[PDB]
Design a protein around this ligand. Structure first.
Ligand SMILES: Nc1nc2c(ncn2[C@@H]2O[C@@H]3COP(=O)(O)O[C@H]4[C@@H](O)[C@H](n5cnc6c(=O)[nH]c(N)nc65)O[C@@H]4COP(=O)(O)O[C@H]3[C@H]2O)c(=O)[nH]1
Ligand SMILES: Nc1nc2c(ncn2[C@@H]2O[C@@H]3COP(=O)(O)O[C@H]4[C@@H](O)[C@H](n5cnc6c(=O)[nH]c(N)nc65)O[C@@H]4COP(=O)(O)O[C@H]3[C@H]2O)c(=O)[nH]1
Lengths: 793, 144, 45, 42
């Protein structure tokens, strides 16, 4: 029958069709798909001039710029996608006297507050409110592009005016006093939002003015420098994690006559005793194990004799500049009794490891140790955070040592020191790096312990109502304690629209337009103000993910306390149960809402849309939370730190070649050689590292050669070689500061896109494994529709 | 040429057309869909050299100004030329009162917010396609 | 009714209220900036 | 007739007395739930 085709169709087109059909048959594509593709091709080339060289040049780089379209994979409704993408592109764009000064301040402040009260309590019609919204939002946007602290204050005040307006409107004209069911839940949501507003106001106060304390130079004479004792308390950590801490301590740039390093062991392990004997540091193994780490430190204080005590965790390695950058203030302020240093984690956190964003997004704790403690510094409320700190022993002996009551002993002892009149200080430069939690369960547990301790301090010591303590200190401490009571409001927020969608209950009795015109400015201004203030500390919309991960596990213990090596990828079902339950509830709500959009009253058309967008936001948040709960592969014994240093390699025949170190770990290095000079996968190599102008040699064995990249494994080193290696790789006083300074800034829209992709990735992750089999089908359907829509944006 | 990559768009004239559309919606305009469409086609006419593009913009600026004046309900140039001497000879108080009555702050605010929205859109959503579509729709409605 | 009178005065004036709010924001920011500078200088000494 | 006078009071004042009634109902429900749990555990 090929003769008929040859006669009817010109042979070039016939050959093209036959070849395309054969290619799609070999790839499994349907013959009907090939026929439809050819029909579209011919109808286009006759109804669309594809001969234009402009479109040919666009097609030349179309694959690189738009790799989401495949010419060899036809799909139903392809021309609709082409038209939609084309429409998106065409749419898209390609001094004075005291009394007079006080009176002037009084009049200015009262006038400004009267104007703010008028702005807050002015009823509007929707158009007037919208104009007000656009104007104030534009003012915020303009002030955003203005570096400094005055702009931060302006944004704080503007946000406070907007939030006070929102709360005033909610408390005046949203509570519907008609129903007994549309009242209790509405007031519950109102109380949740009032708590959130209070937390926001106290946080704005806390970081209103970071102090930016600077190190004070030490005296030139080395005989005036004070004696420092370093404590390293260990209970069950392996020696491989404390060795680097001890080696970095032995290399601290402090006079060895005035530096004693102690290893505290609550396990009575003989390996630690022998290690202490070999390296020359002290050792204490108490017979009675009471009060845990606080008791260990107290027993150590019973023997140590030094002016200052510096507490280090097992995994935290100090830089050599730590004592020189810290001790200056203790000799300047006689009242000082505590100094704090940031906590940095070179190990990838569970979020960073699982979600694949390690060096892109900032760490969870760099907002606290980067901005919050600096804010607490101004009000003299910088509390002990466990490690990377120095305490003067004379004040610490008066208070009876480290507090032993709560599980968070550091905050308690800092609170006692502040209540006895002593001050505290904070230094911003990261001078010690530790290991992050190895799993989501560990993060949940440590946060639970911290929250339990903070609630215990709130119930027992009660910073609000105690003894001599400044009001700013009270506010800072109560804000830190309230931060851990946010689980219940988060649960309310995640389960609020399900009320109306499931059981008709008007939580907010206002038209959807007015809700959009009042709630939205609050959120927009809060996001902008935080993005300016906590700029290189936390990306936008990420705090909700952490909050929702913690909420279900922090709310029960906090409430009770108020009353009284990944071999294979897997999903932590036990940890992820609450997220899956909330996803099921929200999606059954969205099914009911889809029903109500048609079979419900027509007047409730925008309200259902508002509830549905709320449910969609909830689902994105919970999907990100689930995405956290899948553990990525981890077979590296030691974690690697990406640092670029020039180096050199020495062979046994005496040839030296230059190389660039790209990453280092406890027992290896990774280097890059321009051309793969001379190295094989078992040869011994001497590695030359420079610390300033001094060069150090370390024996290595080659483990992997993959072209330019070479992996090296460290040979058994002596103690001095260990110290030198730590001083050349880990305890460098430039790695952590530049690490924190290299964090990208906060882009709210890009952050939203990343979080949406993360939620989609989490849904796809759960589309593979399923605890309750039934959920499998639903998850697969959701992922299917979601990627179909993504292909049709 | 092979590409004719000279359809750069209306660029700043999108705000001009948006102002005209808003004034027409307000009801203060004697709109001329044909003249607006011809002016838009003149603005979108592809030109090879950039110098010719700049010259075309410079020539179209007074043409657009005159078209905007014509499409309004303000009096024609004859009255202005006949009453310029009288306006010059009038007292300052009457001129100030006329200026105050001529300026509407609501109109100024609407124009400013429209300009800000146009800036935001031209940063994210191009406007030439929308302006052309609206002009074509108006022309079709008027002719039919 | 004085609050009613004040509201009716600015019932449909969003531009004026935006100007007043910006003025209040700038002035309160200045006062807070002065106070926080004073407290910061006293804090670092 | 405590229910009659309670309803009359709620009709008189629907703002403060409504909140007070809701708080009292919540407290009574919590107390009754605790008592029932204790009795069942015995
Ligand atoms: N035999 C051997 N080969 C090594 C080693 N380190 C790197 N490679 C090789 O180099 C590739 C690039 O890995 P990367 O740059 O570390 O970037 C890695 C890393 O970010 C991540 N990754 C893979 N496995 C692990 C793991 O066990 N732990 C961690 N933390 N990340 C891992 O995935 C990326 C891609 O890794 P691959 O697809 O496996 O591809 C790896 C692998 O072929 C090593 O210690 N031993
Ligand atoms: N900084 C750095 N160190 C390197 C590199 N290559 C090797 N090492 C060091 O050499 C040790 C032995 O690695 P291996 O023999 O390849 O044997 C490796 C390899 O089979 C596997 N592995 C670890 N990470 C990766 C990875 O990213 N990708 C793959 N494909 N395998 C990995 O786990 C084994 C244990 O590795 P580790 O526990 O990391 O212990 C590593 C590490 O200390 C490198 O490119 N950079």
């Amino acid at each position: 029958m090929s003769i008929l085709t040859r006669w009817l169709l010109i042979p070039p087109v016939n050959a093209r069709l036959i070849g395309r059909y054969r290619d799609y048959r070999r790839h499994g594509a349907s013959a009907f798909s090939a026929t439809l593709g050819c029909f579209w091709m011919i109808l286009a080339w006759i109804f669309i001039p594809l001969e234009h060289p402009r479109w040919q040049r666009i097609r030349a780089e179309h694959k690189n710029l738009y790799p989401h379209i495949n010419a060899s994979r036809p799909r139903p409704l392809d021309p609709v996608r082409y038209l939609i993408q084309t429409c998106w592109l065409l749419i898209g764009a390609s001094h004075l006297s005291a009394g007079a000064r006080r009176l002037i301040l009084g009049i200015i402040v009262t006038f400004s507050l009267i104007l703010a009260l008028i702005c807050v309590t002015q009823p509007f019609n929707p158009l007037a409110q919208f104009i007000f919204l656009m104007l104030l939002w534009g003012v915020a946007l303009i002030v955003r592009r203005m570096p400094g602290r005055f702009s931060a204050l302006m944004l704080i005040v503007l946000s406070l005016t907007v939030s006070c307006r929102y709360i005033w409107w909610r408390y005046t004209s949203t509570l519907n006093w008609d129903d007994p069911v549309s009242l209790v839940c509405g007031l519950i949501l109102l109380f949740a939002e009032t708590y959130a507003w209070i937390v926001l106001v106290l946080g704005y106060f806390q970081v209103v003015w970071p102090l930016n304390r600077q190190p004070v130079p030490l005296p030139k004479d080395m005989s005036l420098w004070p004696s420092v004792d370093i404590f390293v308390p260990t209970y069950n950590e392996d020696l491989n994690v404390v060795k680097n801490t001890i080696y970095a301590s032995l290399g601290i740039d402090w006079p060895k006559d005035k530096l004693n390093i102690w290893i505290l062991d609550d396990g009575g392990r003989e390996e630690f005793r022998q290690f202490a004997q070999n390296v020359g540091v002290k050792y204490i193994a108490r017979t009675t194990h009471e009060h845990a780490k606080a008791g260990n430190i107290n027993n150590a204080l019973k023997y140590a004799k030094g002016e200052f005590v510096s507490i280090f965790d097992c995994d935290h390695v100090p830089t050599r500049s730590f004592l020189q950058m810290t001790m200056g203030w203790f000799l300047k302020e006689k009242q000082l009794a505590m100094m704090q240093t940031p906590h940095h984690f070179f190990s990838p956190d569970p979020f960073e490891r699982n979600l694949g964003r390690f060096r892109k997004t900032p760490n969870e704790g760099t907002l606290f140790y980067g901005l919050v403690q600096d804010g607490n510094d101004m009000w003299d409320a910088t509390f002990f955070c466990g490690s990377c700190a120095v305490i003067r022993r004379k004040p610490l002996d008066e208070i009876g040592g480290i507090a032993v009551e709560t599980v968070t002993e550091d905050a308690h002892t800092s609170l006692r020191l502040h209540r006895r009149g002593y001050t505290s200080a904070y230094m911003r430069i990261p001078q010690a790096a530790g290991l992050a939690t190895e799993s989501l369960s560990a993060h949940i547990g440590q946060r639970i312990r911290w929250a339990r301790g903070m609630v215990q301090i709130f119930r027992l010591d009660n910073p609000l109502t105690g003894k001599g303590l400044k009001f700013a200190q009270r506010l800072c401490y109560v804000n830190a304690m309230f931060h851990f009571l946010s689980g219940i409001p988060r649960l309310i927020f995640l389960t609020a629209p399900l009320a109306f969608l499931l059981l008709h209950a008007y939580i907010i009795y206002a038209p959807a337009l007015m809700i959009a015109l009042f709630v939205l400015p609050h959120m927009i201004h809060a996001s902008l103000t935080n993005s300016k203030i906590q700029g290189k500390y936390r990306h936008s919309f990420w705090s909700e993910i952490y909050e929702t991960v913690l909420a279900w596990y922090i709310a029960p213990p906090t409430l009770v306390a108020l009353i009284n090596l990944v071999e294979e990828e897997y999903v932590d079902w036990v940890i992820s149960r609450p997220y899956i339950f909330l996803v099921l509830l929200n999606l059954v709500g969205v099914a009911v809402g889809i029903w109500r959009y048609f079979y419900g009253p027509p007047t409730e058309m925008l309200t259902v849309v508002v509830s549905m967008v709320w449910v969609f936001y909830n689902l994105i948040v919970l999907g990100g939370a689930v995405a956290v709960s899948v553990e990525s592969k981890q077979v590296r014994r030691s974690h690697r730190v990406e640092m670029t240093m020039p180096a050199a390699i020495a062979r046994e025949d005496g040839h030296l070649f230059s190389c660039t170190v790209q990453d280092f770990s406890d027992g290896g290095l990774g280097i890059k050689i321009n051309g793969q000079a001379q190295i094989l996968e078992g040869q011994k190599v001497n590695l030359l590292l420079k610390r300033g102008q001094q060069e150090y040699v370390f024996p290595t064995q080659v483990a992997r050669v993959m072209g330019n990249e070479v992996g090296l494994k460290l040979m058994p080193l002596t103690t001095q070689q260990h110290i030198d290696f730590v001083q050349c790789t880990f305890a460098r006083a430039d790695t952590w500061a530049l690490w924190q300074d290299s964090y990208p800034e906060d882009k709210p829209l890009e952050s939203l896109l990343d979080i949406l992709k993360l939620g989609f990735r989490g849904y796809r992750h759960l589309a593979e494994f399923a605890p309750s089999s039934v959920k499998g089908i639903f998850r697969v359907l959701t992922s299917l529709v979601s990627w179909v829509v993504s292909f049709i944006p | 040429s092979s590409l004719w990559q000279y359809w750069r768009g209306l660029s700043g004239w999108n705000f001009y057309f948006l102002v005209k559309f808003g004034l027409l919606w307000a009801g203060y305009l004697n709109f001329h869909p044909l003249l607006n469409l011809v002016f838009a086609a003149f603005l979108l006419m592809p030109l090879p050299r950039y110098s010719l593009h700049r010259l075309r913009h410079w020539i179209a600026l007074p043409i657009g100004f005159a078209l905007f004046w014509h499409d309004t309900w303000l009096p024609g140039p004859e009255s202005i030329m006949s009453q310029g001497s009288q306006v010059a000879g009038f007292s300052t108080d009457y001129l100030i009162d006329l200026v105050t009555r001529f300026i509407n702050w609501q109109m100024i605010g609407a124009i400013f917010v429209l300009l800000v929205a146009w800036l935001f859109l031209s940063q994210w959503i191009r406007i030439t396609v929308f302006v052309v579509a609206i002009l074509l729709w108006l022309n079709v409605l008027t002719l039919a | 009714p004085w609050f009613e009178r004040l509201w009716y005065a600015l019932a449909n004036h969003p531009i004026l209220l935006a100007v007043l709010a910006a003025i209040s924001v700038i002035l309160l920011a200045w006062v807070l900036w002065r106070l926080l500078r004073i407290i910061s200088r006293r804090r670092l000494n």
